[PDB]
């Protein structure tokens, strides 16, 4: 049964770690998933549900990097990767806006998705400076940018829930990248996990959390 | 290789995964090494500079547990290992101190070092010796300790269970390889108990101690 999945991280951020059918989460029993929030492609009265298509008005479309099954595959822009309904107490709420990993590290690529997202690391060939660490800051890249070695390790760090490389397809960015005022600073989110945009009126950014 | 390096922890704990021309990290071009932060014999604009012998007045000895190529070594206690220089923007920056480990972890020797590390052992029973305080163990903190498990993970400080089979128990407890002796400087403190910021490896640590009782460590 399509065992269509979020790249695990997305969920986790949602708070949500257990899965009695998709394989990328912790193993529950069946039985168990009816009292306890998981995440599946089924529905359980408190669950996050993964799904090919449109479940409800609620259920948000993500352009994502994704997962069926073992396999993991990479983030196709301009399309729905999967569908993501979050049910509480038996009724769906709404799922905040967030940017989404395209799923090239967990693939090994370092290649660009679209010829559109060429032509912005052209014509920002230098923007996203360091990801602020804690205390000072440290620096980060796109996952296609030259200056990165050509082996990632685990020992690397994406933008991801419990040097830095930023997986999300490049031109996300563009609603930031373009401020009134000369400095700004966003509110956004990573995978569902909450982050900080600080940006420059002329090109750049720091990424934080 | 008859190249010298840290063990590889050291290196990565200042943040130093990519190396060049060492063995023990993860490689990367000579071409890229230029403007990526590596752990190397050589000089590179930023990077982690493991050397033999001083280079520049903020080069830092360690007598640590260091390795040849893919063979590992056991510290010698007092004896210089290698010396470190930190270079950011061709500049040497200066090093924090640190305790550092012996390799015995990684070597699976678990004899101490010298006679000056067992009768060190002897003068802190309650904190390197081991004992069962009653259904469970306490103090096996070093690895020469007594109740300690076949295999133990080479880390900074490494989190196993201690066990007298039948009797005793305890589940994560610290064990650590560093020279027992480069405790000394702590054990005398003003007040009765004390606790102490360190680092072993490079790893923020604290270090509790206890006067003329036990000290222990965590991360």
């Known amino acids: 049964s399509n065992k269509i999945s979020c790249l695990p991280r997305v969920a986790q951020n949602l708070g949500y770690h257990y899965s009695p059918d998709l394989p990328g989460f912790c193993p529950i029993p069946k ?34 990097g994704y997962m069926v099954g073992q396999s993991v595959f990479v983030q196709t822009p301009g399309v729905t990767s999967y569908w993501l309904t979050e049910w509480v107490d038996g009724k769906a709420r709404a799922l ?9 590290f967990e693939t090994n690529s370092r290649a660009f998705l679209d ?55 490049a031109p996300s960015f563009e609603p930031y990248l373009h401020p009134e005022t000369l400095s700004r600073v966003y509110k ?7 982050c900080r945009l600080m940006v420059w009126r002329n090109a750049t950014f720091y990424v934080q959390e």
């Open 96 to 104: 905040p806006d967030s940017l989404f990993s395209s799923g090239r």
């Open 31 to 64: 039985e168990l998933a009816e009292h306890w929030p998981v995440v599946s492609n089924d529905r359980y009265p408190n669950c996050l549900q993964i799904t090919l298509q449109q479940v409800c008005e609620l259920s948000k479309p993500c352009s994502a």
């Open 188 to 194: 956004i989110m990573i995978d569902f996990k909450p």
């Open 115 to 169: 010829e559109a997202e060429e032509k912005f690391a052209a014509a920002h060939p230098h923007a996203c400076l360091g990801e602020i660490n804690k205390s000072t800051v440290g620096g980060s890249h796109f996952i296609f940018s030259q200056y990165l070695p050509p082996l990632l390790p685990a020992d690397a760090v994406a933008l991801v829930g419990a040097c830095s490389v930023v997986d999300v397809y």
